[PDB]
Design a protein around this ligand. Structure first.
Ligand SMILES: NC(=O)c1ccc[n+]([C@@H]2O[C@H](COP(=O)([O-])OP(=O)(O)OC[C@H]3O[C@@H](n4cnc5c(N)ncnc54)[C@H](OP(=O)(O)O)[C@@H]3O)[C@@H](O)[C@H]2O)c1
Ligand SMILES: NC(=O)c1ccc[n+]([C@@H]2O[C@H](COP(=O)([O-])OP(=O)(O)OC[C@H]3O[C@@H](n4cnc5c(N)ncnc54)[C@H](OP(=O)(O)O)[C@@H]3O)[C@@H](O)[C@H]2O)c1
Ligand SMILES: Cc1ccc(-c2cc(C(F)(F)F)nn2-c2ccc(S(N)(=O)=O)cc2)cc1
Ligand SMILES: Cc1ccc(-c2cc(C(F)(F)F)nn2-c2ccc(S(N)(=O)=O)cc2)cc1
Lengths: 340, 341
């Protein structure tokens, strides 16, 4: 009857500053097309702080709901919805307002899953971004060289594995030897711990002919280095620029004045990807990801914060600590919060 | 005998200060697989001043030859070359050192043409660049919105027409009402004189959903504006940035600190194109352009300087005048120089 949820109360890229835990909120009811989902696991996303900062609709003022993705059970559903879905059914979704004990979700955008496991939630945003971007924009083929940044992260792990399944040679960047060992176990050809080995040196000394594809999530100096490392007809996909999201503009500084000249001289491209522009591809991607997840052909690494200082990310209140864990570079795989 | 040719004697983007007219040069002799071409028309190219600046191979010291393209008669040729070519035959080529009375050209890269006309020379660099870039990178299809910058120039006129033949809606920028009237005669849907109409405002008011493809060859403020005007999944092709080539570095200033953010938010791309990376496509492009030019299906506008202050661009010495004419923005169509004989 009553539930907790996170609410953006003030526009800020600092999540603690922007977001309030409300305690005594009414449990909303599903429309005729709508499911009501008991959230069991919610995904933490780099762009949670872009959403809290208001960078999606700068018209929209607080208060508003937050959280992009959830997995759980249908507890209620409208009549139309009850054609395809039933109460107690395991479902996952990508829709704003997952950071709640219960969320209303249009049946038309729900993904049926085999059970409530956090591994299936890793696919909804992180998996589908890597799958659709690389398939529509990567032009991957046997022997291509792929650089993946934030390679041991939520979406990074999927860029790494999908590139390997395409029989590419894969380089992955990360901030620890533990993360390097994770990348090697995923079949990464050249893991780089950029804390102990300068990435620019590795690419100069081991990849003098450069790389065909960059899955670039980090921005700043990592972007500039990826541009310099492009082969003739190379493709840098701008997945994100996490290094800038905490700043007041949300932008990371890049050497952009000489960029059009570098791309002309290499016949090379910088291509942006936003998942919400490729929804016509989402169903097929999520189906193929699930088949690989269930079969064990795809590692779907989940970071529930068990080895963090204050331990497992349990409850809505743990989302503040889980966002900080991400921005401290501490996670291996997808950061997930459990609502028990 | 002896001949005249232009030589780069000093690296600089200032063409007049980089390039000397030699008068005492020996006519080179063709090898077994070579043509010796007597140049009748030579092409002037925005990037002649990047070449004189040494920006292509920054290892190569002066002196070296210059000029990218020629059309003329085979006056001598090697025995193996005589399998495909005959003395007296009309040929065109894209190879360095066209700015000479006579140029040695491998038979393997020469294009046979129906006669020595300047219209055919327009296709070699300007025509093939627009054709190959838009076919390989444009994703043109019916109803796509195409913005062409320098649309009344050498390559611009082809980007404009080839986009109209792909059934696209086409916007063209140029600096005069005469140039705007030339664009309207090519079927341009929306000529813009950017001197008398703010381009940014036209695009915002008349194309609020944005443009699907930009053929961008100007750089600077025009590049910034083109990025802002891109539709969702829009494609900006960097053909060039002529606004920068006279500068010490050859670069034009852009306000592109936010470029990655804008491309991510629109799922849009910025794609470089260099003709020399796509030579496996050149022969098919040139064959198709030639068919359309001979049939009258394609306007191949030539600017021989007949309405410039000092009149027709005649002789190698007129190349200095022809380059200044381009960089003053005066030309309609391809700037060609005639070497009469
Ligand atoms: N375009 C789209 O539709 C879309 C969708 C999903 C995600 N993304 C993007 O993908 C990227 C990764 O997001 P995610 O949610 O999956 O997170 P994540 O990669 O699981 O975690 C972020 C990782 O990035 C690195 N990092 C953190 N703070 C950093 C900083 N200040 N500077 C540099 N590196 C830093 C750290 O790994 P290291 O050990 O490697 O340093 C950290 O583990 C983000 O840019 C996000 O916006 C975009
Ligand atoms: N990527 C490749 O392989 C390749 C191959 C060929 C050509 N290109 C590029 O295509 C572009 C056009 O070259 P082109 O030889 O065909 O010349 P063009 O367009 O026939 O002549 C240049 C035109 O650009 C405009 N312009 C000239 N100086 C300018 C300046 N300082 N600032 C702004 N606009 C200026 C003028 O037209 P307006 O009336 O419109 O101002 C002028 O008529 C250049 O960037 C060239 O490098 C590239
Ligand atoms: C300054 C700035 C700009 C973009 C982003 C960003 C990152 C991401 C994502 F998806 F990569 F995670 N999206 N995303 C984003 C995407 C679309 C919009 S939109 N539709 O309001 O213009 C707004 C933000 C962040 C900060
Ligand atoms: C600083 C700078 C550098 C390059 C150019 C430019 C323009 C053009 C052209 F042909 F497209 F018009 N090419 N072109 C160019 C392209 C590639 C090379 S290369 N040999 O390094 O790959 C060399 C020159 C302009 C300014």
């Amino acid at each position: 009857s009553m539930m907790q949820k996170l609410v953006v109360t003030r526009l800020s890229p600092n999540f603690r500053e922007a977001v309030t835990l409300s305690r005594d909120c009414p449990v909303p009811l599903p429309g005729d097309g709508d499911l009501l989902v008991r959230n069991r696991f919610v995904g933490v996303n780099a762009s949670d702080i872009n959403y809290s900062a208001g960078r999606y609709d700068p018209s929209v003022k607080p208060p508003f709901d937050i959280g992009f993705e959830g997995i759980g059970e249908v507890v209620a559903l409208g009549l139309s919805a009850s054609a395809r879905y039933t109460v107690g059914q395991a479902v996952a979704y990508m829709a704003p307002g997952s950071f709640a004990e219960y969320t209303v979700v249009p049946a038309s955008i729900a993904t049926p899953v085999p059970s409530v496991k956090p591994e299936y939630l890793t696919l909804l945003v992180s998996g589908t971004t890597a799958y659709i971007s690389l398939k529509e924009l990567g032009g991957l083929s046997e022997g291509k060289k792929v650089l993946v940044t934030a390679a041991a992260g939520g979406t990074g792990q999927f860029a790494m594995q999908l590139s390997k399944k395409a029989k590419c040679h894969v380089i992955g960047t990360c901030s620890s030897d533990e993360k390097s060992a994770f990348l090697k176990s995923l079949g990464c050809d050249r893991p780089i711990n950029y804390k102990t080995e300068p990435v620019g040196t590795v690419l100069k000394q081991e990849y003098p002919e450069g790389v065909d594809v960059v899955y670039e999530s980090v921005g700043g100096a990592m972007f500039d280095l990826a541009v310099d490392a492009l082969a003739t007809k190379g493709r840098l996909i701008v997945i994100g620029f996490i290094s800038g999201y905490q700043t007041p503009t949300g932008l990371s500084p890049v050497k952009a004045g000489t960029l059009p000249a570098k791309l002309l001289k290499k016949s090379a491209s910088v291509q942006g990807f936003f998942l919400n522009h490729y929804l016509s591809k989402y169903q097929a991607a999520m189906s193929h990801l699930l088949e690989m997840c269930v079969s064990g052909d795809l590692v779907c690494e989940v970071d529930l914060g068990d080895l963090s200082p204050e331990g497992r990310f349990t409850g809505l209140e743990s989302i503040f600590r889980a966002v900080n864990y991400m921005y401290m570079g501490k996670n291996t795989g997808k950061i997930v919060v459990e609502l028990p």
